[PDB]
Design an enzyme around this catalytic site. Structure first.
Site, PDB file in Angstrom:
ATOM      1  N   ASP A 193       3.442   2.446   7.461  1.00  0.00           N
ATOM      2  CA  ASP A 193       2.211   1.679   7.298  1.00  0.00           C
ATOM      3  C   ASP A 193       2.270   0.570   6.273  1.00  0.00           C
ATOM      4  O   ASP A 193       1.512   0.590   5.260  1.00  0.00           O
ATOM      5  CB  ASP A 193       1.012   2.570   7.041  1.00  0.00           C
ATOM      6  CG  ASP A 193      -0.288   1.844   7.259  1.00  0.00           C
ATOM      7  OD1 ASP A 193      -0.304   0.607   7.098  1.00  0.00           O
ATOM      8  OD2 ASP A 193      -1.287   2.509   7.594  1.00  0.00           O
ATOM      9  N   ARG A 204      -1.513   9.163   2.290  1.00  0.00           N
ATOM     10  CA  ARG A 204      -1.873   8.856   3.652  1.00  0.00           C
ATOM     11  C   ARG A 204      -0.758   8.145   4.379  1.00  0.00           C
ATOM     12  O   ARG A 204      -0.559   8.358   5.560  1.00  0.00           O
ATOM     13  CB  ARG A 204      -3.108   7.976   3.670  1.00  0.00           C
ATOM     14  CG  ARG A 204      -2.795   6.518   3.895  1.00  0.00           C
ATOM     15  CD  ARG A 204      -4.020   5.683   3.603  1.00  0.00           C
ATOM     16  NE  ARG A 204      -4.203   5.491   2.175  1.00  0.00           N
ATOM     17  CZ  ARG A 204      -4.126   4.312   1.578  1.00  0.00           C
ATOM     18  NH1 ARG A 204      -3.867   3.226   2.286  1.00  0.00           N
ATOM     19  NH2 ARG A 204      -4.303   4.216   0.275  1.00  0.00           N
ATOM     20  N   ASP A 243       0.826  -1.186   0.000  1.00  0.00           N
ATOM     21  CA  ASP A 243       0.000   0.000   0.000  1.00  0.00           C
ATOM     22  C   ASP A 243       0.859   1.234   0.000  1.00  0.00           C
ATOM     23  O   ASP A 243       1.696   1.414   0.857  1.00  0.00           O
ATOM     24  CB  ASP A 243      -0.910  -0.007   1.223  1.00  0.00           C
ATOM     25  CG  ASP A 243      -1.174   1.373   1.768  1.00  0.00           C
ATOM     26  OD1 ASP A 243      -0.267   2.223   1.738  1.00  0.00           O
ATOM     27  OD2 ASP A 243      -2.299   1.597   2.252  1.00  0.00           O
TER      28      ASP A 243
HETATM   29  C1  LIG Z   1      -3.720  10.998   6.866  1.00  0.00           C
HETATM   30  C2  LIG Z   1      -4.251  10.194   8.022  1.00  0.00           C
HETATM   31  C3  LIG Z   1      -3.252  10.319   9.151  1.00  0.00           C
HETATM   32  O1  LIG Z   1      -2.208  10.943   9.008  1.00  0.00           O
HETATM   33  N1  LIG Z   1      -3.640   9.717  10.264  1.00  0.00           N
HETATM   34  C4  LIG Z   1      -2.883   9.752  11.339  1.00  0.00           C
HETATM   35  C5  LIG Z   1      -2.221  10.880  11.782  1.00  0.00           C
HETATM   36  C6  LIG Z   1      -1.458  10.767  12.930  1.00  0.00           C
HETATM   37  N2  LIG Z   1      -0.807  11.812  13.437  1.00  0.00           N
HETATM   38  C7  LIG Z   1      -1.535  12.906  13.657  1.00  0.00           C
HETATM   39  O2  LIG Z   1      -2.720  12.903  13.355  1.00  0.00           O
HETATM   40  C8  LIG Z   1      -0.997  14.047  14.207  1.00  0.00           C
HETATM   41  C9  LIG Z   1       0.338  14.038  14.543  1.00  0.00           C
HETATM   42  C10 LIG Z   1       1.074  12.894  14.314  1.00  0.00           C
HETATM   43  C11 LIG Z   1       2.405  12.883  14.658  1.00  0.00           C
HETATM   44  N3  LIG Z   1       3.178  11.757  14.443  1.00  0.00           N
HETATM   45  C12 LIG Z   1       2.629  10.675  13.915  1.00  0.00           C
HETATM   46  C13 LIG Z   1       3.425   9.569  13.724  1.00  0.00           C
HETATM   47  C14 LIG Z   1       2.901   8.420  13.177  1.00  0.00           C
HETATM   48  C15 LIG Z   1       1.571   8.398  12.835  1.00  0.00           C
HETATM   49  C16 LIG Z   1       1.053   7.314  12.307  1.00  0.00           C
HETATM   50  C17 LIG Z   1      -0.207   7.157  11.974  1.00  0.00           C
HETATM   51  N4  LIG Z   1      -0.268   5.930  11.473  1.00  0.00           N
HETATM   52  N5  LIG Z   1       0.804   5.410  11.491  1.00  0.00           N
HETATM   53  C18 LIG Z   1       1.714   6.221  12.010  1.00  0.00           C
HETATM   54  C19 LIG Z   1       0.779   9.504  13.018  1.00  0.00           C
HETATM   55  C20 LIG Z   1       1.294  10.655  13.567  1.00  0.00           C
HETATM   56  C21 LIG Z   1       0.493  11.772  13.765  1.00  0.00           C
HETATM   57  C22 LIG Z   1      -1.427   9.577  13.628  1.00  0.00           C
HETATM   58  C23 LIG Z   1      -2.087   8.459  13.177  1.00  0.00           C
HETATM   59  C24 LIG Z   1      -2.829   8.561  12.023  1.00  0.00           C
HETATM   60  C25 LIG Z   1      -3.523   7.467  11.535  1.00  0.00           C
END
Ligand SMILES: *CCC(=O)Nc1cc(-n2c(=O)ccc3cnc4ccc(-c5cn[nH]c5)cc4c32)ccc1C
Length: 307
Positions: free
Chosen positions: A162, A148, A144
């Site tokens: 991911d 995103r 994938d």
């Molecule tokens: C586009 C969808 C997405 O980005 N979802 C998502 C964002 C995440 N996220 C956040 O929302 C704010 C800050 C942030 C900071 N560090 C991370 C690091 C890793 C992830 C992540 C998400 N999925 N795998 C890793 C997300 C982070 C942050 C967090 C989770 C999600 C799903």
């Protein structure tokens, strides 16, 4: 037999007491991810990190799938691909990853487009391509790929993530053949969609799509379109429309990715160089209006060992 060097990637296992989860950035049916500080026992250094706590594995097969996902994530060692910091095998497995504050790349472009410089776009494309190739070098297929699934440590730096879908390749095998699973259609190469077949060349098609998203500031591809059609249209030969910004030179490349025949589509190594070439002069390639105008905790990358 094969002379390939031993892979010494080290998988650290962590006690829950080792880290804590301060706030939750995201909640997923598959999993929950938490903003957290992990402090290694011993050193008084706090590494900001993101923790993913996955749903309980109903069946062992699910259990295996996690291990592999962990296995690769631990294994990869490149700047544009985020390594897995460590794992702790709690009943609900928790994966510890470097924390990228800006978050989903796709999210970032959407909210920063106006301040979103043309030069940055070329660079991200380079960065992403740079990462995927490494994955290609490792015989690893990222099943994938999407905006995103790219996270931004900073606008300057971005790395892939991911991988749960991703699968390693037996040396003999050119291609990896899937069994039915949830998949998002728009990104997948037709070869994958029709025949549940994946190859790096499959990845490129998706990678091209990611670029489209970058060019369009997150516009969703095939917007308003049913998954089922997608097989049909491409067979049809319709493709995603040119970004308003893109020079044919750029949009052209994206088209090349969407070529039906896998071999014809550009190999990644190629992509980095070509894009990089654009990157030296973004302005010629990408047309963005007003383009010219556009504490006690140590980060992990600094954390990583130095001779
Ligand atoms: C586009 C969808 C997405 O980005 N979802 C998502 C964002 C995440 N996220 C956040 O929302 C704010 C800050 C942030 C900071 N560090 C991370 C690091 C890793 C992830 C992540 C998400 N999925 N795998 C890793 C997300 C982070 C942050 C967090 C989770 C999600 C799903």
């Amino acid at each position: 037999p094969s002379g390939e060097a031993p892979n010494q990637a080290l998988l650290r296992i962590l006690k829950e007491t080792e880290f804590k989860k301060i706030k939750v950035l995201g909640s997923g049916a598959f999993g929950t991810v938490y903003k957290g500080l992990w402090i290694p026992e011993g050193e008084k250094v706090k590494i900001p990190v993101a923790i993913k706590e996955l749903r309980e594995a109903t069946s062992p097969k699910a259990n295996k799938e996690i291990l592999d996902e962990a296995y690769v994530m631990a294994s990869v060692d490149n700047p544009h691909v985020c390594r897995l910091l460590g794992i702790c095998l709690t009943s609900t497995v928790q994966l510890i990853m470097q924390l990228m504050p800006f978050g989903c790349l796709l999210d970032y472009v959407r909210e920063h487009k106006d301040n979103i410089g043309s030069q940055y776009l070329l660079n991200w494309c380079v960065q992403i391509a740079k990462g995927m190739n490494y994955l290609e070098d490792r015989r690893l297929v990222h099943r994938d790929l999407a905006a995103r699934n790219v996270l931004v440590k900073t606008p300057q730096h971005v790395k892939i993530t991911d991988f749960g879908l991703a699968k390693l390749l037996g040396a003999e095998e050119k291609e990896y053949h899937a069994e039915g699973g949830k998949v998002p259609i728009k990104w997948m190469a037709l070869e994958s969609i029709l025949h549940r077949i994946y190859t790096h060349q499959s990845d490129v098609w998706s990678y091209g799509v990611t670029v489209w998203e970058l060019m369009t500031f997150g516009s969703k591809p095939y917007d308003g379109i049913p998954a089922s059609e997608i097989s049909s249209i491409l067979e049809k030969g319709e493709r995603l429309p040119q970004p308003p910004i893109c020079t044919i030179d750029v949009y052209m490349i994206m088209v090349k990715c969407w070529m039906i025949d896998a071999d014809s589509r550009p190999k990644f190594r190629e992509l980095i160089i070509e894009f990089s070439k654009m990157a030296r002069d973004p302005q010629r390639y990408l047309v963005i209006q007003g383009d010219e105008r556009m504490d006690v905790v140590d980060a992990d990358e600094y954390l990583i060992p130095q001779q």
